[PDB]
């Protein structure tokens, strides 16, 4: 039961629980990415650290969503967290591409919940999404895009040298 | 007259004046609640202090609304402030229930003004409401709900002991 | 590939990957426990905070295991993380019981990996387990047991009062 | 004579003296490696410094073993220290390979002494080895492996440029 729930639809409550699963799944993905780049046969620390910090951001995102769910009187429901899509992530370029795909899917999920909030006339939700999630995703996606462009420029015909340099001088 | 008013309907101007009266009425209510719990025959300081701090928050809310009304070129109009609904407020449980009812009515009023702002295409209003009022009401209502649950748990068959303990260890 | 792997069996590598899943599953469980006690209709902050800090410990445990897997030249493999066993966790007593059951299962898993390490003559593993996991589990299980005894003592015929007091004065 | 020796076999005493020779031999090897990279015609300072710091670690390892030998009532016996395997060490890649081979041989020696300690039921020995030597060797071997992977990536078709960059940006 709740004695506080007001203007908080069951449709929004469910979408929020699905978004928590997506953020947690994203955190798991980034955990796998991070550790992949710490393999002795991959050994790009800067990449490890970039992805591990993203794991932590996505976990924090889920936690903020859960706290908001309780603030509105909604009920957290957790599902299975699906294993990441790959067991090995190839090059930094391959990984950065996979990260951007992931983030775009999270952003589209937030866009979808915002739409549903407008359709439900729930301005607290739409406010919460904007401040804490939408702006963050846009900034993060721009940083990833910038990274991908710099990695692409560095491939050329010297791909090993380029992957080292990016790691040392960007991820730095 | 005003030389600044832009995109600010007479309907929003009136709703803002009604919301100022509701916040001020709420502040008055909480003043009465606070002093009730300072009666020698009630004597729960922690409760006094909880309600008096809410009186101050609601007054500040009204003041922020009034400042915003002038910022938009609207004209403050004050009405009679109706005396609080009760002269004595019973137990902490009764009081916390009355507070939650009050806050929910304020929240619904803010929701109503937001709706009217969307219908009027006034995004400054909808922004102002979100940041300074809607998030605050959700947090406050959750805290009140948490309090009510803890008070309810403490009643049991030892209601005096429970009311003391909550006051001492929560309101603390 | 690895150029470093030495004295590190495929059986230990797999058991380490299973233990990472168990620690992560435990972290997820504790996340669900934490948020349950932050429901407005449960509202025991101290319990929220106890379980959330355990979520963080178990995540750190998994991370340490993953770092060790790479240090030995083993390859992380992630599986589905199964949703926690319950969606609502009942009383603090019920929850503390569930936590102790969980921790005992983790401890038995560590015991099992240690046995396998002896059978494999892998003293680095057995060392790593002892310092970072076995001592920690024993201390944590003793704290949980102490908590359970104090909760049990407090039930009596005044269960609500007892649950409040434990939260306020132990979890404090 | 000794008035303190307890549970300390002559087989362990001899293995400890052989391990001291191996650590000292390793220290000598790293001294030769360090100075090779300070030749005017090699001139990679970062490599000099990496190997010289390893010379010092291995000397400290031997000293700790000797102190432990006396702590148990065993008697240090020193042998000839064989000259390093090469007089010139080729590229950083060649050197890092030789270092990893060396470290793996030290690790296997520690593994062998641990086995012998279990067979002798000497838990102090097995404890001493773990804390001060086994964990250190695993960390060092992982760092070397990481280095070798980065050097390999940098060779490509620009081996001089790659060797400079690694020295400047990793060994740094
Ligand atoms: Ir950092
Ligand atoms: Ir950082
Ligand atoms: Ir960082
Ligand atoms: Ir919106
Ligand atoms: Ir929020
Ligand atoms: Ir105060
Ligand atoms: Ir205060
Ligand atoms: Ir106060
Ligand atoms: Ir709006
Ligand atoms: Ir404003
Ligand atoms: Ir804390
Ligand atoms: Ir704490
Ligand atoms: Ir804490
Ligand atoms: Ir063991
Ligand atoms: Ir370890
Ligand atoms: Ir130095
Ligand atoms: Ir240094
Ligand atoms: Ir140094
Ligand atoms: Ir042993
Ligand atoms: Ir020792
Ligand atoms: Ir820089
Ligand atoms: Ir640097
Ligand atoms: Ir205390
Ligand atoms: Ir306190
Ligand atoms: Pd919005
Ligand atoms: Pd708005
Ligand atoms: Pd052990
Ligand atoms: Pd040992």
Beta bridge partners of A81: C81
Sole residue written with tokens 């310092």: C131
Spatial distance between the Cα atoms of B91 and B95, rounded to a whole number of angstroms: 6
Chain A, nearest residue to B147 by Cα:
A3
Q: Which H or E run contains A5?
A: none
DSSP β-bridge partners for residue C81? A81
Q: If contacts are CB pairs under 8 Å, which of residues 146-165 in chain D contact chain C?
A: 148-149
Q: What is the CA radius of gyration of chain D?
A: 18
Tokens of C54: 């355990």
Other beta carbons less than 10 A from residue A40's beta carbon: 24
Long-range contacts of C123-131, Cβ-Cβ distance < 8 Å, separation of 24 or more: C123/D111, C123/D114, C123/D126, C123/D129, C123/D130, C123/D134, C124/C7, C124/C72, C124/D130, C124/D134, C124/D135, C124/D138, C125/C12, C127/D130, C127/D131, C127/D134, C127/D135, C128/C68, C128/D135
Query: Chains D, B in contact: 3+ Cβ pairs under 8 A?
Result: no
**What distance lies between CA B33 and its chain's CA centroid?**
12
Of A41, A43, A161, the CB nearest to D162: A161
Residues 6+ apart with CB under 8 A from C71: D138, D139, D142
The residue whose two tokens read 């920690």 is C136
Cα dihedral D54→D55→D60→D62 (10° resolution) = 120
> How far apart, in whole angstroms, are the C-alpha atoms of residue C135 and residue C128?
11
Contact C111, C81 (CB under 8 A): no
Between the alpha carbon of residue A29 and those of residues A22, A126, C64, C96, C104, the distances in Å are: 10, 27, 17, 31, 28
Classify D63 as helix, strand or coil.
Answer: helix
> d(Cα D58, Cα B30) in Å, to the nearest integer?
74
- Helix (H) / strand (E) element for C93: namely helix C92-120
> Nearest CA to C32 among C50, C52, C46?
C52
**Is the C-alpha dihedral spanning A26, A32, A36, A37 positive or negative?**
positive
Which of D149, D155, D160 would best serve as a mutation to test chain A binding (most A beta carbons within 10 A)?
A: D149
Report d(CA C76, CA C20) in Å as an integer: 9
Q: What is the C-alpha separation between A163 and A91, in angstroms, rounded?
A: 8
Angle between helices D10-37 and D45-72 (to 10 degrees): 160
**Is any Cβ of chain C less than 8 angstroms from the Cβ of A48?**
no
Return the half-sphere exposure (C-beta side, CA atoms, 13 A cut-off) of residue B154. Answer: 28
D142 interfaces chain C, CB cutoff of 8 Å: yes
Angstrom distance (rounded) from CA D99 to CA C45: 54
Facing residue for C83 by CB, picked from A1, A78, A83: A78
- Measuring CA to CA, how many Å separate A150 from each of A167, C91, D109, D160? 11, 54, 46, 24
CA–CA separation, A68 and A17 (whole Å)? 11
Write out the H or E segment, with its range, that includes residue D3.
none
What is the 3-state composition of chain A as percent helix, strand, coil, each rounded to the nearest 5?
Answer: 75, 0, 25
Hey, what are D134's tokens? 């086994």
Q: How far from B161 is each of A14, A86, C168, C170, CA to CA, in Å?
A: 40, 59, 15, 19
Token pair for residue A12? 């929004």
Q: How far apart are CA D65 and CA D19, in angstroms?
A: 8
Q: Is B136 annotated as a binding residue?
A: no
Nearest CA in chain C to D128: C127
Domain harbouring D122, CATH code: 1.20.1260.10
Please classify residue D41 by burial: count the beta carbons closer than 10 Å to its beta carbon, then call 0-12 exposed, 13-18 middle and 19+ buried: exposed
Q: Is A41 within 8 Å of D149 when comparing Cβ atoms? A: yes
Token digits for C123? 């003293």
Residue C10 makes CB contacts below 8 A (sequence gap 6+) with none
Alpha helix locations (H) across A38-86? 45-72
- The closest of D110, D124, D129, D20 to D66, measured between CA atoms, is D20
Q: Is B4 exposed, middle or buried (0-12, 13-18, 19+ CB in 10 A)?
A: exposed
Give how far Cα A92 sits from Cα of A106, A147, D171, Å. 21, 10, 22
Angle at C43 between CA C60 and CA A78, to 5 degrees: 50
Using an 8 Å Cβ cutoff, are B118 and A119 in contact? Answer: no
Domain count, chain B: 1
Distance of CA A45 to the CA centre of its chain: 20
Token look-up 């395997």 returns D85
D164 close to D38: Cβ distance less than 8 angstroms: no
Is A53 annotated as ligand-binding? yes
Which residues lie below 8 Å from residue D69, measured CB to CB, with a gap of 6+?
Answer: D13, D16, D17, D20, D75, D76
Cα–Cα distance, C80 to C59 (Å, whole number): 15
| Cβ burial B146-155 (10 Å sphere, 16+ → b, else e) | bbbbbbbbbb
Q: Between chains, do B158 and C158 touch, taking CB under 8 Å as contact? A: yes
| B60 is known to lie in a ligand binding site | yes
Compute φ and ψ for C81, nearest 5 degrees: -100, 115
Q: Are B100 and B144 in contact (CB under 8 A)?
A: yes
Q: How far apart are CA C105 and CA C102, in angstroms?
A: 5
Residues in chain C: 172
Task: Answer for the pair C73, C4: CB distance below 8 angstroms, yes or no.
Answer: yes
Place of tokens 């009266």: B21
Calculate the alpha carbon distances from B98 to B29, B50, B70, B95, B126 in Å. 10, 14, 32, 5, 28
Write out chain A residues lying below 8 Å of B131, CB-based: 127
The DSSP code sequence of B111-160 is HHHHHHHHHHT-HHHHHHHIIIIIHHHHHHHHHHHHHHHHHHHHHTT-HH
Tell me whether residues D100 and C70 touch, CB distance under 8 A.
no
Range of the domain at D45: 1-172
All chains having 3 or more CB pairs closer than 8 angstroms to chain B: A, C
Per the document, the length of chain B is 172
- Other beta carbons less than 10 A from residue C108's beta carbon: 11
Name the region of C49 (left: φ>0; alpha: ψ -120 to 50; beta: rest). Answer: alpha
CA distances from residue C26 to A12, A19, C22, C31 in whole angstroms, order as listed: 28, 21, 6, 9
Q: Using what technique was this structure determined?
A: X-ray
Report the half-sphere exposure of D128 (CA within 13 A, side-chain side).
Answer: 19
DSSP H helical ranges for B41-134: 45-72, 92-120, 123-129
Using CB atoms, which residue from A3, A72, A124 is nearest to B100? Answer: A3
Helices (H), D38-158: 45-72, 92-120, 123-129, 135-155
The dihedral of CA D12, D18, D24, D25: what is its sign? negative
Measured in residues, chain A has a length of 172
The residue count of chain D comes to 172
Cα(A9)–Cα(A77) distance, integer angstroms: 15
Closest CA to C16 of C91, C55, C66: C66
Measure Cα distances from A85 to A53, A88, B40, B154, C43 in Å: 19, 9, 67, 49, 38
- In 3D space, the residue among C110, C101, C99 whose CA is nearest the CA of residue C50 turns out to be C99
| Cα three-residue angle C72-C78-C82, rounded to 5 degrees | 140
What is the distance between the alpha carbons of residues C86 and C89, in angstroms, rounded to a whole number?
6
Residue A143: how many other CB atoms lie within 10 Å: 12
Name which of B70, B164, A45, D132 is nearest C165 in CA terms.
Answer: B164
Distance, in Å, from the CA atom of C37 to the CA atom of C44, rounded to the nearest integer, reads 5
| Residue D23 near residue D59 (C-beta atoms within 8 A) | yes
């Amino acid at each position: 039961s709740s004695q506080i729930r007001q203007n908080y639809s069951t449709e929004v409550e469910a979408a929020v629980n699905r978004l928590v699963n997506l953020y947690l799944r994203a955190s798991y993905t980034y955990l796998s990415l991070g550790f992949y780049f710490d393999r002795d046969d991959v050994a790009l620390e800067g990449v490890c650290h970039f992805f591990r910090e993203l794991a932590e951001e996505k976990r924090e995102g889920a936690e903020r969503l859960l706290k908001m769910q309780n603030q509105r009187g909604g009920r957290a429901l957790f599902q299975d967290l699906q294993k990441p899509s790959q067991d090995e992530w190839g090059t930094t370029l391959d990984a950065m591409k996979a990260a951007i795909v992931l983030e775009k899917s999270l952003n589209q999920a937030l866009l979808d919940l915002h739409a549903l909030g407008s359709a439900q006339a729930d301005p607290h939700l739409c406010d919460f999404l904007e401040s804490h999630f939408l702006d963050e995703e846009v900034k993060l996606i721009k940083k990833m895009g910038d990274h991908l462009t710099n990695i692409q420029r560095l491939v050329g015909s010297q791909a090993g040298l380029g992957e080292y340099l990016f790691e040392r001088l960007t991820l730095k």
